[PDB]
């Protein structure tokens, strides 16, 4: 009864794991990435977040009403996290050829990490909601 949930048709789960993987990709290849490629890894993280927000949006009407507002808040937290990452990416671009380059990239990594952690929190929230839905039914 404490076994992992069946993820076969679980779109939210798929998109959360894709987002975490995209963050891992950014983290892995940021050190060797040329300045013009900063927008590419960040847009890709953002693209995966867009799908996650979409998949949660579709699910929300079928989750218990008491679950929806906290899940909505976590969606807005992910948006705030992405805004922060974009900000750090811009700073990294502005300071490509200055002595602030390494610090800006360090802050990009930190912002991207926070986004992935908050994505996992959304997954937990959605999983809880689905369990509580099965209780009401």
């Amino acid at each position: 009864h404490m076994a992992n949930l069946d993820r076969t048709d679980d779109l939210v789960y798929l998109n959360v794991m894709e987002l975490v993987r995209a963050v891992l990709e950014l983290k892995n290849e940021l050190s060797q990435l040329p300045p013009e490629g900063y927008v590419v890894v960040v847009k890709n993280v953002g693209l995966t977040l867009r799908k996650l927000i979409g998949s949660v949006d579709d699910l929300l009407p079928s989750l218990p009403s008491s679950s929806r507002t906290e899940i909505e808040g976590t969606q807005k937290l992910l948006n705030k996290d992405l805004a922060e990452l974009i900000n750090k990416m811009r700073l990294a671009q502005q300071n490509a050829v200055t002595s602030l380059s390494e610090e800006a990239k360090r802050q990009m990594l930190t912002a991207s990490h926070t986004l992935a952690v908050d994505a996992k929190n959304l997954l937990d929230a959605v999983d809880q909601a689905k369990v509580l839905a099965n209780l009401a039914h």
Binding site: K43, G46, R50, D57, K76, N79, L82, I86
Partner: peptide
């Protein structure tokens, strides 16, 4: 369109 989705599309617009 939900508020979260609109807010995000505004962010992705700043990248494109």
């Amino acid at each position: 369109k939900t508020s979260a989705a609109a807010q995000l599309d505004e962010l992705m617009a700043h990248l494109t």
